Every structure is written in C-alpha cells, then in structure tokens.
Design an enzyme around this catalytic site. Structure first.
Site, short mmCIF file in Angstrom:
data_model
loop_
_atom_site.label_atom_id
_atom_site.label_comp_id
_atom_site.label_asym_id
_atom_site.label_seq_id
_atom_site.Cartn_x
_atom_site.Cartn_y
_atom_site.Cartn_z
N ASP A 1 0.79 -1.26 0.00
CA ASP A 1 0.00 0.00 0.00
C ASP A 1 0.81 1.28 0.00
OD1 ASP A 1 0.77 0.01 2.65
OD2 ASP A 1 -1.21 -0.55 3.45
N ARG B 1 1.00 6.86 0.24
CA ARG B 1 0.27 5.84 0.96
C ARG B 1 -1.16 5.80 0.39
NH1 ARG B 1 -2.68 2.59 3.24
NH2 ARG B 1 -2.49 1.77 5.39
N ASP C 1 -5.72 -1.09 3.75
CA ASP C 1 -4.64 -1.62 4.55
C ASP C 1 -4.23 -2.97 4.04
OD1 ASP C 1 -2.75 -1.61 6.66
OD2 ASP C 1 -4.13 -2.56 8.08
N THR C 2 -3.02 -3.05 3.54
CA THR C 2 -2.45 -4.34 3.19
C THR C 2 -1.66 -4.90 4.37
OG1 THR C 2 -0.50 -3.20 2.19
CG2 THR C 2 -2.34 -3.93 0.67
N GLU D 1 1.53 -6.31 6.41
CA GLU D 1 2.98 -6.00 6.30
C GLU D 1 3.65 -7.15 5.61
OE1 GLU D 1 3.88 -2.86 7.20
OE2 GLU D 1 1.73 -2.61 7.80
N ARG E 1 4.06 11.13 4.17
CA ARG E 1 3.61 10.35 3.00
C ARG E 1 2.42 11.02 2.34
NH1 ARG E 1 2.76 4.45 5.61
NH2 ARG E 1 1.13 5.68 6.63
#
Ligand SMILES: Cc1cn([C@H]2C[C@H](OP(=O)(O)O)[C@@H](COP(=O)(O)O)O2)c(=O)[nH]c1=O
Ligand SMILES: [Ca+2]
Length: 129
Positions: free
Chosen positions: A15, A29, A34-35, A37, A75
C-alpha cells in the site's frame, strides 16, 4: 477529484509506492486501504500485486481526495491509477487489502471500495479465505 500525472520511482509494499510527483520524490500511501505488512500472511502477495501493477503501467496517475494530502509521516495520501485502473480498488477486489483508515473528508471512494471488499469476501479471496 482530478487525476494528476506521476512517474514510478520504486515499488515499496502493498500500500505504499515511491513516485515522482510535481518533480519531487514522494512516498504515497494508498487511501482507504490496509495491506498486511511484508512479514504477515498475504504481505508478500500484496507487495507483489502492487509492484506488478505499477511497474507494468505505462501511465501512473495520482488522485488526491478533499481532505488532508499528507499524513503525519510525510507520506502523500492518494488514490493511485495504473493505466486508468485504481490500485486501491484492485487490491481490495483481490482480497489483498481491507478497507481501512476511513476518515471524514478523505472518503470519496469508500463506497466503491466497500463494494469491492464485499465481492472479495463473497469469493473467499486471499485474506478472506
Ligand atoms: C491510510 C492513512 C494512514 N494514516 C496513518 C495512520 C496510522 O498511524 P500509526 O502509524 O500511528 O498507526 C498509519 C498506518 O499506516 P500504515 O498502514 O502504512 O502502517 O498511517 C493516516 O494518518 N491517514 C491515512 O489516510
Ligand atoms: Ca499496511
């Protein structure tokens, strides 16, 4: 919202991506998602999916929402398009990201993404499997 030109510097993870935007390197971002980690389940698949999408694209575009454009880490917060396809939505449709971080004001594509998440969950894809 409007799409603005950018060029790929480097894929980072599922992401985040490093792009050159108005001639400056910036870590973007992805809004509303939300991907996992890289070190979690489906993390490597999410990073790979995003990497392929942005690296194969002939045209990358950045689309800011109505609210804040940078987060507390510096970001950029954006929807990112690869040859006209939204990365944010594609990750969600594939069950490689959850809709997340939905803040008042940057949520123009929420419904679109929740619609994708629903289909992904229906198909038991990846994170939903
Ligand atoms: C997606 C997004 C994340 N963030 C911040 C919230 C989280 O703060 P915290 O780091 O304190 O948890 C962080 C999660 O990003 P990551 O999922 O990349 O770790 O990014 C925003 O502020 N606005 C956003 O739109
Ligand atoms: Ca993440």
């Amino acid at each position: 919202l409007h799409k603005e030109p950018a060029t790929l510097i480097k894929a980072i993870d599922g992401d985040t991506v490093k792009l050159m935007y108005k001639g400056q390197p910036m870590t973007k971002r992805l809004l509303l998602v939300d991907t996992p980690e890289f070190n979690e389940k489906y993390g490597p698949e999410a990073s790979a999916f995003t990497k392929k999408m942005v690296e194969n694209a002939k045209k990358i575009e950045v689309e800011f929402d109505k609210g804040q454009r940078t987060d507390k880490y510096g970001r950029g917060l954006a929807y990112i398009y690869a040859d006209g396809k939204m990365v944010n939505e594609a990750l969600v449709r594939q069950g490689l990201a959850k809709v997340a971080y939905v803040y008042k004001g940057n949520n123009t594509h929420e419904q679109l993404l929740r619609k994708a998440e629903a289909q992904a969950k229906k198909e038991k894809l990846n994170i939903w499997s």
